[PDB]
Amino acid sequence: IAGGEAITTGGSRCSLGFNVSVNGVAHALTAGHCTNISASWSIGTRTGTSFPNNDYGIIRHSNPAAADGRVYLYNGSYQDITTAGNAFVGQAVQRSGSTTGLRSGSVTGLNATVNYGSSGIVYGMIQTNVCAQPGDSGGSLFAGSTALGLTSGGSGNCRTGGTTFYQPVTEALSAYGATVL
């Protein structure tokens, strides 16, 4: 299972962010607002979660063979991921998610504060003009083979377009001592 593909718990669905390694043990990063729901996922068991404030969480794979170090492009192809990096304003990026598939756009701001109402407030988010819809959360924000972020939330949709916010991947990686596969 690669970045952008569906992960579920009961009736809830999110998207996988990036497959990573923690001391050689395969895990998957996704949004924290997703992992707060349950410890039991289609792919394994939750081992960490942080939301709101941050928006990241990590799941240990039940099947290490499933930890595919790529992002699914929703066209029968995949993008290989080799490193993690920090986004910059004006950067051309792509987002992969289980509701709307693959979408492209650019980074329009950094360190954005986002109020999700009853769900709370998150800080330090990457802002983009890429659209997203419910179910896309946790999915991959990347630029070629460089991982950048995990879909958190936004406004609008993929028909009208909108604004989307992503948790920087490097903070989630350092939280857990993980490296991207």
Coordinates of C-alpha atoms in Angstrom, one line a residue:
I1 CA 0.0 0.0 0.0
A2 CA 1.5 3.3 -1.1
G3 CA 1.1 7.0 -0.2
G4 CA -2.3 8.4 -1.0
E5 CA -4.2 5.1 -0.7
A6 CA -7.1 4.5 1.6
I7 CA -6.7 3.3 5.2
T8 CA -9.8 2.6 7.3
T9 CA -11.0 1.9 10.8
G10 CA -14.7 0.8 11.2
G11 CA -16.6 3.1 8.9
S12 CA -13.9 5.9 8.8
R13 CA -11.6 6.5 5.9
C14 CA -8.4 8.5 5.7
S15 CA -5.4 8.3 3.3
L16 CA -1.9 6.9 4.0
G17 CA 0.8 9.7 4.1
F18 CA 4.1 8.0 3.7
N19 CA 5.6 4.6 4.6
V20 CA 8.5 5.1 7.0
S21 CA 11.0 3.1 9.1
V22 CA 11.6 3.5 12.8
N23 CA 14.8 1.6 13.7
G24 CA 14.0 -0.7 10.7
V25 CA 10.4 -1.4 11.7
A26 CA 7.9 -0.5 9.0
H27 CA 5.2 2.2 9.9
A28 CA 2.9 4.5 8.1
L29 CA 2.4 8.2 8.8
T30 CA -1.1 9.7 8.5
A31 CA -3.1 12.7 10.0
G32 CA -3.4 12.8 13.7
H33 CA -7.1 13.7 13.4
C34 CA -7.4 10.3 11.8
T35 CA -5.3 8.2 14.3
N36 CA -7.2 9.9 17.2
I37 CA -10.3 7.9 16.1
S38 CA -9.0 4.3 16.9
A39 CA -5.9 2.2 17.6
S40 CA -7.1 -0.4 15.1
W41 CA -6.6 0.2 11.3
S42 CA -6.8 -1.9 8.1
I43 CA -3.0 -1.8 8.0
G44 CA -2.0 -2.3 11.6
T45 CA -2.0 -0.8 15.0
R46 CA -1.6 2.9 15.9
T47 CA 1.6 3.6 17.9
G48 CA 1.3 7.4 18.2
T49 CA -1.0 10.3 17.6
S50 CA -0.9 14.1 17.9
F51 CA -3.9 16.3 17.2
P52 CA -4.8 19.2 17.4
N53 CA -1.8 21.6 17.8
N54 CA -0.1 19.3 15.4
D55 CA -1.8 16.9 12.9
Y56 CA 0.2 13.7 12.6
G57 CA -0.1 10.0 13.7
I58 CA 1.8 6.8 13.0
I59 CA 0.7 3.2 12.5
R60 CA 2.9 0.1 12.7
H61 CA 2.2 -2.2 9.8
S62 CA 0.9 -5.7 10.5
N63 CA 2.5 -6.8 7.2
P64 CA 5.9 -5.2 6.7
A65 CA 5.8 -6.4 3.1
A66 CA 3.1 -3.7 2.5
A67 CA 5.4 -0.8 3.3
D68 CA 5.7 0.5 -0.2
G69 CA 8.1 3.6 -0.3
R70 CA 6.2 5.4 -3.1
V71 CA 3.1 7.5 -3.7
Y72 CA 0.3 6.2 -5.8
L73 CA -0.5 8.5 -8.7
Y74 CA -4.0 7.2 -9.5
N75 CA -3.1 6.4 -13.1
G76 CA -1.7 3.0 -12.6
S77 CA 1.8 4.5 -11.9
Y78 CA 3.7 5.4 -8.7
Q79 CA 6.1 8.1 -7.7
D80 CA 9.2 6.8 -5.9
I81 CA 10.0 8.7 -2.6
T82 CA 13.6 9.0 -1.5
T83 CA 13.8 11.9 1.0
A84 CA 11.8 14.3 3.1
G85 CA 12.2 18.1 2.8
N86 CA 10.7 21.5 3.7
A87 CA 8.3 23.3 1.4
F88 CA 8.9 26.8 0.1
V89 CA 6.5 29.5 -1.2
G90 CA 5.9 29.1 -4.9
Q91 CA 6.9 25.4 -5.0
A92 CA 5.1 23.2 -7.5
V93 CA 3.6 20.3 -5.5
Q94 CA 1.3 17.3 -5.9
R95 CA -1.2 15.8 -3.4
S96 CA -2.4 12.2 -3.6
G97 CA -5.6 11.1 -1.6
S98 CA -8.2 8.4 -1.6
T99 CA -11.2 10.6 -2.4
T100 CA -10.0 12.9 -5.2
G101 CA -6.8 11.0 -6.4
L102 CA -3.9 13.2 -7.6
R103 CA -4.1 17.0 -7.8
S104 CA -1.4 19.6 -8.4
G105 CA -0.9 23.2 -7.4
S106 CA 1.6 25.4 -5.5
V107 CA 2.6 26.3 -2.0
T108 CA 1.1 29.7 -1.1
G109 CA 2.1 30.1 2.5
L110 CA 3.9 28.6 5.5
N111 CA 3.4 28.4 9.2
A112 CA -0.3 29.0 8.8
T113 CA -2.7 28.7 11.8
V114 CA -5.9 26.9 11.1
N115 CA -9.1 26.8 13.2
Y116 CA -11.2 23.7 12.7
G117 CA -13.9 24.8 15.2
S118 CA -15.1 22.1 17.5
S119 CA -12.0 20.0 16.4
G120 CA -9.5 22.7 17.6
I121 CA -6.7 24.7 16.2
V122 CA -3.5 23.5 14.4
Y123 CA -0.3 25.6 14.0
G124 CA 2.7 25.6 11.6
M125 CA 0.8 24.3 8.5
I126 CA 1.9 24.5 4.9
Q127 CA -0.8 26.3 2.8
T128 CA -1.5 25.4 -0.8
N129 CA -4.0 26.2 -3.6
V130 CA -4.5 22.4 -4.1
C131 CA -8.0 21.1 -3.6
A132 CA -9.0 18.3 -1.3
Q133 CA -12.2 16.6 0.0
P134 CA -13.1 14.5 3.1
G135 CA -11.2 11.2 2.9
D136 CA -8.1 12.8 1.5
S137 CA -6.8 13.6 5.0
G138 CA -3.4 12.1 5.9
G139 CA -2.5 11.8 2.2
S140 CA 0.8 12.7 0.6
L141 CA 2.0 16.2 -0.3
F142 CA 5.3 15.8 -2.4
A143 CA 7.4 17.4 -5.1
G144 CA 9.0 14.6 -7.2
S145 CA 10.8 12.2 -4.9
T146 CA 10.8 14.5 -1.9
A147 CA 8.1 14.0 0.7
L148 CA 6.7 17.3 2.1
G149 CA 3.5 17.0 4.1
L150 CA 0.4 15.2 5.3
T151 CA -3.0 16.5 4.2
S152 CA -4.8 18.1 7.2
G153 CA -7.8 20.1 6.0
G154 CA -8.9 23.1 4.1
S155 CA -11.9 24.8 2.4
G156 CA -13.8 24.3 -0.8
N157 CA -13.6 21.2 -2.9
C158 CA -12.2 19.7 -6.1
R159 CA -14.9 21.2 -8.3
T160 CA -14.7 24.8 -7.2
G161 CA -11.2 24.5 -5.9
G162 CA -10.1 25.6 -2.5
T163 CA -7.2 26.1 0.0
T164 CA -5.6 23.2 1.8
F165 CA -3.3 22.9 4.8
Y166 CA -0.7 20.2 5.4
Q167 CA 1.4 19.1 8.4
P168 CA 5.1 19.4 7.5
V169 CA 6.4 15.8 7.3
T170 CA 9.8 16.6 8.9
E171 CA 8.1 17.4 12.2
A172 CA 6.3 14.1 12.2
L173 CA 9.5 12.2 11.3
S174 CA 11.5 13.8 14.1
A175 CA 8.6 13.2 16.6
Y176 CA 9.0 9.4 16.1
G177 CA 12.6 9.0 15.0
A178 CA 11.4 7.8 11.6
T179 CA 12.9 8.0 8.1
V180 CA 10.9 7.8 4.8
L181 CA 11.2 4.6 2.8

